[PDB]
C-alpha cells in the first residue's frame, strides 16, 4: 500500500503545519507586542513559508492567517513603497483596514476604536510624507460626517502637523492594537506546540 | 518577573524551532526521495526561514542543517547559474561535495560511492553545457590517478556525450543519494512533531 502510506504521511504533514502556523502566530504576536522588530521580521518570513505549504484551511486557521497579515501591514504602516494588494494604489494601512473588517471576531468598542484610528492614520501617513493628492485619494477610498469633514479640511489645508493627528496618533493606534494582541496571546498560549515546548523548559527548571 | 518570563518564553521558542527543523528536514528528505519538485521547493523555503530563527545549535542540529543544504545543492546540480558560496566560481555540485565531506557521518562504501559520483558529475554538467574551460577549472579544484587521468582526457577532447558519463551517470548519482536519504528518513521518522502528528492521524482512522 504505497498510496495509503503516502496519503497518511501527507495528512500528518497537514496536522504538523497547522501546529506550526499557530506557534508562529503566537511568536509574531509577542514580537509585535514587545517591539522586537528583527524577531518580527524573521518570524513573518517563517509564517509566510509555512502558509504556502498549507492548502485546505479551517475557519480557525483562516482567522490565524488574517491576524498575521494584519500585524504585518500595521508594522509596515509608514512604508508607503510597500504593495500588499494586486491594486498598487492601496496603501499598507488601507490593506490592514480591509483585513480588520474581514476577521470573524466581535465588533466590540475596541474593534471600532482600532478601525477609526487606522482610518485617521492612513490619511496622516500620506500627509507626513508630503503626499497631499494621495491623502485625498485614500480619503475617498475609505470614506464612501463630523470626523469625515474635519479630515477633508485638514487635507485641503496641507496641515501635516495638525493637532488632530497628535490627539489620535500613530502611537495611540499601536497601543490599542497591542491591547488586542494581548488577547490573542492569551488565547493562543495554550496551543499544542507552545504548551509542549513550555512543559519541556519547566521540566528542566 | 518580566525578564524571567521573557527568558522562559525565548527558551520554549528555541525548543519549538528545533522540533520544526527536524520535521522540515524529514519532509524535505521525503520530497527529494519521491521526486516531488514543488513540495521540495516550498519545504526548502520553510526550512531556510526556520534556520534563520535558530541561534545556538547542537551537533545533531548542525548535521540536520547540512543534510538540508546538501539536498538543496544536489537538486540544483544542473543549475550552473546558482551561487551557493561566497566564492562565485564554486558550482552547485562542488558545494554539495564540500558539505558531504563536513557531515559527521560514517565513511562507509556508500559514502565514498556518492562522493565519487558527485565528482564525476560536477565535471559532466559543465561539459554538457559547452563550458569546457569551466570543466577544467572544476577538475583542478576537485582533483588536487587512473580515474583522474580518464577525466582529464575526456575534458581535453570535449567529449560531452562520452560513454564514461553514461556509466557513472547523473541518474546513478541520484539513486545512490536516494538510498542514503532512505536511512535519514528512517532515523528522523521518530522525531517529536512527526510522531505526534502521525498519532493524531491514526487516532482518526
Ligand atoms: N504576505 S504577507 O506579508 O501579507 C504575510 C505576512 C505574514 C504571514 C503571511 C503572509 O502572507 C501569507 F503568507 F499569509
Ligand atoms: N541556503 S540553502 O539553499 O543552502 C538552504 C537550503 C535548505 C535549508 C537551509 C538552507 O540554508 C540555510 F538556511 F540553512
Ligand atoms: Ca506608494
Ligand atoms: Ca555559473
Swiss-Prot record, chains A, B:
Residues 1-205 are annotated as: TRFH mediates dimerization. The acidic N-terminal domain binds to the ankyrin repeats of TNKS1 and TNKS2. The C-terminal domain binds microtubules. This is Telomeric repeat-binding factor 1. The modification Phosphoserine is found at residue 156. It comes from Homo sapiens. The gene is TERF1. Binds the telomeric double-stranded 5'-TTAGGG-3' repeat and negatively regulates telomere length. Involved in the regulation of the mitotic spindle. Component of the shelterin complex (telosome) that is involved in the regulation of telomere length and protection. Shelterin associates with arrays of double-stranded 5'-TTAGGG-3' repeats added by telomerase and protects chromosome ends; without its protective activity, telomeres are no longer hidden from the DNA damage surveillance and chromosome ends are inappropriately processed by DNA repair pathways. There is a cross-link at residue 150 (Glycyl lysine isopeptide (Lys-Gly) (interchain with G-Cter in SUMO2)). Changing residue 17 to P: Abolishes dimerization and telomere binding. Highly expressed and ubiquitous. Isoform Pin2 predominates. Induction: Expression is tightly regulated during the cell cycle; levels are low in G1 and S phase and increase during G2 phase and mitosis.
Amino acid at each position: 500500500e504505497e498510496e495509503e502510506d503516502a496519503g497518511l504521511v501527507a495528512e500528518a504533514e497537514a496536522v504538523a503545519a497547522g501546529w506550526m502556523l499557530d506557534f508562529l502566530c503566537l511568536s509574531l504576536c509577542r514580537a509585535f507586542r514587545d517591539g522586537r522588530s528583527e524577531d518580527f521580521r524573521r518570524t513573518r518570513n517563517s509564517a509566510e513559508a509555512i502558509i504556502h505549504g498549507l492548502s485546505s484551511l479551517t475557519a480557525c486557521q483562516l482567522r490565524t492567517i488574517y491576524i498575521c497579515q494584519f500585524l504585518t501591514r500595521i508594522a509596515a504602516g509608514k512604508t508607503l513603497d510597500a504593495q500588499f494588494e494586486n491594486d498598487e494604489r492601496i496603501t499598507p494601512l488601507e490593506s490592514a483596514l480591509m483585513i480588520w473588517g474581514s476577521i470573524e471576531k466581535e465588533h466590540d468598542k475596541l474593534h471600532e476604536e482600532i478601525q477609526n484610528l487606522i482610518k485617521i492614520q492612513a490619511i496622516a501617513v500620506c500627509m507626513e510624507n508630503g503626499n497631499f493628492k494621495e491623502a485625498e485619494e485614500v480619503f475617498e477610498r475609505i470614506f464612501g460626517m463630523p470626523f469625515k469633514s474635519k479630515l477633508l479640511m485638514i487635507i485641503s489645508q496641507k496641515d501635516t502637523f495638525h493637532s488632530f493627528f497628535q490627539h489620535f496618533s500613530y502611537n495611540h493606534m499601536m497601543e490599542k492594537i497591542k491591547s488586542y494582541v494581548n488577547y490573542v496571546l492569551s488565547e493562543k498560549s495554550s496551543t499544542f506546540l507552545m504548551k509542549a515546548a513550555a512543559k519541556v523548559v519547566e521540566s528542566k527548571r
